[PDB]
A paper describes a structure:
To reduce the public health threat of Omicron and future emerging variants, we and others have proposed development of antivirals targeting the relatively conserved heptad repeat 1 and 2 (HR1 and HR2) regions of the spike glycoprotein (S) that drive membrane fusion by the formation of the HR1HR2 postfusion bundle. Although the ~130 residues of the HR1 and HR2 regions are conserved in all prior SARS-CoV-2 variants, a few mutations have reached fixation with Omicron in the HR1 region (Q954H and N969K for all Omicron subvariants, and, additionally, L981F for BA.1).
Starting with the previously reported longHR2_42 peptide we chose to insert an additional residue between HR2 residues G1167 and D1168 which are proximal to the Omicron HR1 K969 sidechain, anticipating that this insertion would restore inhibition activity. We selected glycine due to its flexibility, hydrophilicity, and proximity to the naturally occurring glycine in HR2 (G1167) (peptide referred to as 42G). To confirm our prediction that 42G better accommodates the Omicron N969K mutation, we determined the cryo-EM structure of the complex of the Omicron HR1 and a slightly longer version of 42G, termed 42Gv2, to an overall resolution of 2.8 Å. In addition, the structure features a bulge of the 42Gv2 backbone at the inserted glycine residue. This bulge results from the deviation of the 42Gv2 backbone around the long sidechain of the lysine residue of the mutated HR1 N969K, promoting closer overall packing with HR1; additionally, the terminal nitrogen of this lysine and the carbonyl oxygen of the inserted G form a hydrogen bond, presumably contributing additional binding energy to the interface. Additionally, the insertion reduces the overall displacement of HR2 in this region, partially restoring the HR2 backbone to the original position in the Wuhan strain structure. The average Cα atom rmsd for HR2 residues 1,162 to 1,170 is reduced from 2.4 Å (between the Wuhan strain HR1HR2 structure and the Omicron HR1HR2 structure) to 1.5 Å (between the Wuhan strain HR1HR2 structure and the Omicron HR1—42Gv2 structure). Our structure of the Omicron HR1—42Gv2 complex shows that the glycine insertion restores the backbone interactions on both sides of the inserted glycine and Omicron HR1.
Numbering used by the authors:
A (entry chain B), B (entry chain A), C (entry chain C): 918 to 988
D (entry chain D), E (entry chain F), F (entry chain E): 1159 to 1201
Amino acid sequence: ENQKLIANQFNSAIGKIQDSLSSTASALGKLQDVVNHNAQALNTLVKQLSSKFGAISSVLNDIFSRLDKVE
Amino acid sequence: ENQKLIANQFNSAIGKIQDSLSSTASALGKLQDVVNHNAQALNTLVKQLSSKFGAISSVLNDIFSRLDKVE
Amino acid sequence: ENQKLIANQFNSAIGKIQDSLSSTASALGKLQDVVNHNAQALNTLVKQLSSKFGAISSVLNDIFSRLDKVE
Amino acid sequence: HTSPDVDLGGDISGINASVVNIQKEIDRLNEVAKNLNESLIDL
Amino acid sequence: HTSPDVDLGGDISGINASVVNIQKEIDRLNEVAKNLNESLIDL
Amino acid sequence: HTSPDVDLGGDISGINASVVNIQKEIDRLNEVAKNLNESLIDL
């Protein structure tokens, strides 16, 4: 009878730990997807910012060139 | 006696696994708070960058307009 | 004999839960390293962006000053 | 002719950052950490 | 009159990114993964 | 003399964001959640 109690409560504990491991797996999966998304987004921001700032550089350069042409 | 050993060590194991699940819960909670903070921050950066760059656009536009007025 | 079965399967379950806790520890460690890297990167981006935009501010200011000098 | 509008470059509005919602899983972990007391053996 | 100072827009200094410190929890998980060997049954 | 090239400031290309790959650990967690059924006691 005590063996039946140990077996039943061990089966219950293993079921609950299975649920906990499935929950931890799902949570780490969502965290992975989100952190990777944000990383790709920050990398895209870095690259396209580099592009836009280079464009701004060229624009200001032509600005200063026109100014020198005037003066 | 062997049943008492099994019961005691199973109780110890379940206590340690309770501590581990509480630690995993706290860790995932902190990771969630931090990743969400960083996501909101990156979104704020994106929006306010869009604003500042639009402003720069208007400014350079007026610049070029004044230049054309001169030349 | 049933006690030997309970003991063997409990040892197997504790071994598998040890593997699962080691995997969760490694996963949270990698997530921590990556989220902290991305946070430092976003902070660096914020600071150096502030710098570049201040520079752009000064440049446009001198631009407008030269313009006023012309006109 | 006058100068055209300056196209400063890419449209940074396309960038966006998702938001992770794992409160279900964290709450489940805490619920299990509390329910494992219903599985302790008491001979 | 001369042109005023250009206000390029928002003050991006307000943006900031936190840093997660879960080394306590990771160390606790490894400590438990090592201490579960003190709970293996040996009849 | 003409004006020099404007150095807009820092070289933002040095910034970069890593990518976390914990699919090994997530797959191991699911494999263990499936293998714990081989450890349930059936007297």
